[PDB]
Structures are given as structure tokens and as C-alpha cells.
């Protein structure tokens, strides 16, 4: 577990948070955190996102450890448009993810922040608004589940 902590590169207090409250990192409620590679990759992604936040990370993590973080503060932290993050969160809420994303966890659970960031990354890859991805994912034309 030392080799884990040093290889992941996560900050000491977010490692404390991960150990104490796996639910905040979206691990299954009521179970000890896994050092499975599946958890290792998400820990690495969290550390990379924290490093990307730069100097703002100090305030972002504090607002994340409370149930305080919002779209506008995180948008200022990542130098992104607040409307962009708000609409990406709206689109994620509208669509059926597993686990489901709801306004009271959308910036409270790491799985929800990661889903929103994936939406934002895919939108900016396509150089379109998240409504563009929402229109795209409706084109399930090879299925019988829905019209």
C-alpha cells in the first residue's frame, strides 16, 4: 500500500479522503477501497486532474471535500466556460448513465465529475457544444429498444 500511494502520485489529503470515504470517490458504499487496477487507473486520473488544476487545486479540493463544489467554481478552476460545464452536467443528468447522475452528486461524487469531464472532452474534440453530442448519441439506429 506504500507502493500504491507512491505510484499513484495522489496528494496526501486526497489519499486520506479516499481511505476514509470511498463513497466520495464513488466506490461501492460500505466496502473497503480496492487496490484493484480498475481503482488504480481512476486514482491516477484523479491525481492527473488535480495536477492539471494547478494552483486552484488547493481551493478546488477543499470545496470538493465539503459538499460545496459547483459548476462555476470548477469552471473558473479549469479556465472553462461556466455555461459549458452547466450544460454538460445537464446533458449528463438527462442521459442514463450507470451509476446515475443527479444534481446532488453531479459535483459531489468523483464518478460524476469524471463523467462530466468526459462529456466536455468529447465535445471539445468534436469542436461542438454538448448538445451536439446529445444529438449524436440519439442516432442509435441499429437497435430495437427504441424508435
Amino acid at each position: 500500500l506504500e507502493m500504491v500511494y507512491h505510484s499513484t502520485g495522489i496528494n496526501e489529503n486526497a489519499f486520506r479522503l479516499f481511505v476514509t470515504k470511498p463513497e466520495m470517490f464513488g466506490a461501492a458504499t460500505g466496502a473497503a477501497p480496492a487496490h484493484d487496477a480498475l481503482s488504480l487507473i481512476m486514482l491516477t486520473r484523479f491525481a492527473d486532474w488535480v495536477n492539471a488544476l494547478g494552483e486552484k487545486a488547493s481551493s478546488v479540493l477543499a470545496a470538493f471535500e465539503a459538499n460545496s463544489l459547483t459548476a462555476e467554481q470548477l469552471a473558473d478552476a479549469m479556465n472553462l466556460d461556466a455555461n459549458l460545464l452547466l450544460q454538460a452536467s445537464i446533458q449528463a443528468q438527462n442521459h442514463q448513465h450507470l451509476p446515475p447522475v443527479t444534481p446532488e452528486n453531479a459535483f459531489s461524487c468523483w464518478t460524476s465529475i469524471n463523467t462530466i469531464l468526459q462529456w466536455v472532452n468529447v465535445a471539445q474534440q468534436l469542436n461542438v457544444a454538448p448538445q451536439g453530442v446529445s444529438a449524436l448519441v440519439g442516432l442509435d439506429y441499429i437497435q430495437s429498444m427504441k424508435e
Binding site: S58, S59, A62, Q73, D81, I90, A123
Partner: protein, 292 residues
């Protein structure tokens, strides 16, 4: 040909030299509507900007219908035409709309030529300076002229705004500074979230200033060394000067000063525990102003 038309030919010769843009683009920069007329056996500016290539066999022209610029509205083909012409997404389109006019309560705008010309003016303001809509907005806020609306502005005022933007962009390029850094240094709104650095600052100041006597010595001079230690300063008098400047500014939504900060720390602060205090957000704002 008269004084009025002869006044802005000098301006367009300047813009075509400085920015190396075409004549029509410079005229747009001179607060002139887009020309529907096509001459010189060339497609018109409106046609080149919107009509070509034709999108799904639909011809775009000025009309009395109303077009929505709300990003989440998922507008009709006209919004797609605007996005393709301006090479921007829906969110940045709404941001550009907010930049151009502050009187547009809703995203819906008139499809007349004047609004399109205003939007093109706003887009070219960022295009000529190699910035996108986000840095354009943050730059206008950092300048202080962002309050003024581009839709309703005088030609001389627009020229002054252009000169201010060009000068600040040149200064930033000379200083190797990003627009975000300038916005942070010139920002007034402060995040009201407790941080470990702010908590350490509060603990150090509370421990150092305990037992302080008002008449024995100046409060600011006594508080300066702990502020310097906590906020990573090389010199103590730099912290003293920063504290004087902050007291003159009175940062935050609840005007904060050294006496008020010391009284709050003395009375309502309990070090080593995480508790919610009504005034704590103002304390955080004051600390953020000091760090800035």
C-alpha cells in the same frame, strides 16, 4: 464624398495596414453594416459569409423572424448558419451575444442585418487579436470597458476601445503574460471557500496576536510579520504595505479591515476545528485579496 465618408477611409487604411485585413472587414470594424450588394463579379459579403456553401438547400437572408441564441435551446437551421459563419460553438455564441449587448435579457435576437453586423464586429474584435470569445470577455472585464455595450456605441468610442485592446494585448505579449493571469491579478470577486493555507494563516495570526494591546503598539505593524510568514513573503514591510493597501480597498462583499479581522479572530474563531461561521466567508475573501 464628404467629411463623414472621408473620415473613416483613413481609419480603414490604418486597419488594413495594422491588421492586414480586407477592406470589407475593416469597414465592419468601422461600425458599418454588412453589404448585400455583390459587385466586381464577386459574391457579396453576406453571400460569402452565410449563403455559401448552401446548407441543406436553404437560402439565408434578412427577415423579420426571431432567432434564439440560447445554447441549450437547440435552435433551428439559422443558428447552425450563424455557428458555421462565425466558426464558433453554441456556448461561445451565447457568450459573444452577451459580450455585444448587455440589454438582451433573453437569447432571442432580431434577424435583421444590424444585429448580424454587431455580432460580426464582436467576433472580429477577438479574431484580430488572436483570442477567442472567452479571453475576449475576460480581457474586456480586466480593462474595465466591458460594462459598455458594443451594440450601442459611438464610432470614436469604438476606436478608443480598439486602441485600448491593442495596447493591452501588446503589453501582455511583451510581458509573457496570459490573459487569465491578468484577470486573476485584476479580479475583484473572491472565492468564499476555506483553504488549508487560509486556515494556517488564521491559526498563525491568532496565536501571534493573542494578548495584543491596542495602545502599546500599532495593530498593523504587529500583525505584519505573521501575515508575511503565512502568505510567503520575503520582507515584513511588504506585508505591512499590502495590509495598508487592503485596508484602503476594504475587500469583499462585507467590507473587511484589520480591526474587524482581528476582532473576528479574537471572538468568533476557534483554531483546530472545522465549524461554519456566517462571517467566515468574508474572512476568506479578505485573505484571498491579501494573497492577490
Amino acid at each position: 464624398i464628404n467629411t463623414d465618408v472621408l473620415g473613416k477611409v483613413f481609419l480603414t487604411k490604418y486597419y488594413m495596414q495594422r491588421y492586414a485585413i480586407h477592406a470589407e472587414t475593416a469597414l465592419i470594424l468601422c461600425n458599418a453594416p454588412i453589404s448585400q450588394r455583390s459587385y466586381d463579379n464577386q459574391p457579396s459579403q453576406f453571400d460569402r459569409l452565410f449563403n455559401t456553401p448552401l446548407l441543406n438547400g436553404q437560402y439565408f437572408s434578412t427577415g423579420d423572424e426571431e432567432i434564439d441564441l440560447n445554447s441549450g435551446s437547440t435552435g433551428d437551421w439559422r443558428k447552425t448558419i450563424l455557428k458555421r459563419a462565425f466558426n464558433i460553438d453554441d456556448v461561445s455564441l451565447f457568450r459573444l451575444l452577451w459580450i455585444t449587448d448587455h440589454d438582451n435579457k433573453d437569447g432571442k435576437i432580431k434577424n435583421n442585418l444590424k444585429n448580424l453586423s454587431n455580432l460580426y464586429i464582436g467576433k472580429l474584435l477577438a479574431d484580430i487579436h488572436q483570442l477567442t470569445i472567452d479571453e475576449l470577455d475576460l480581457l474586456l472585464i480586466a480593462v474595465g470597458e466591458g460594462k459598455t455595450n458594443l451594440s450601442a456605441i459611438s464610432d470614436k468610442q469604438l476606436a478608443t476601445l480598439i486602441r485600448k485592446l491593442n495596447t493591452i494585448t501588446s503589453w501582455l505579449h511583451t510581458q509573457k503574460w496570459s490573459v487569465f493571469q491578468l484577470f486573476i491579478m485584476t479580479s475583484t470577486s473572491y472565492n468564499k471557500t476555506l483553504t488549508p493555507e487560509i486556515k494556517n494563516l488564521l491559526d498563525t495570526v491568532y496565536h501571534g496576536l493573542q494578548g495584543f494591546d491596542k495602545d502599546k503598539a500599532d495593530l498593523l505593524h504587529v500583525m505584519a510579520p505573521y501575515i508575511a510568514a503565512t502568505l510567503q513573503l520575503s520582507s515584513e514591510n511588504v506585508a505591512h504595505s499590502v495590509l495598508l493597501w487592503a485596508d484602503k480597498l476594504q475587500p469583499g462583499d462585507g467590507a473587511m479591515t484589520a480591526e474587524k479581522f482581528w476582532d473576528w479572530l479574537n471572538t468568533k474563531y476557534t483554531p483546530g476545528s472545522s465549524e461554519a461561521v456566517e462571517t467566515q466567508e468574508h474572512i476568506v475573501q479578505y485573505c484571498q485579496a491579501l494573497a492577490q
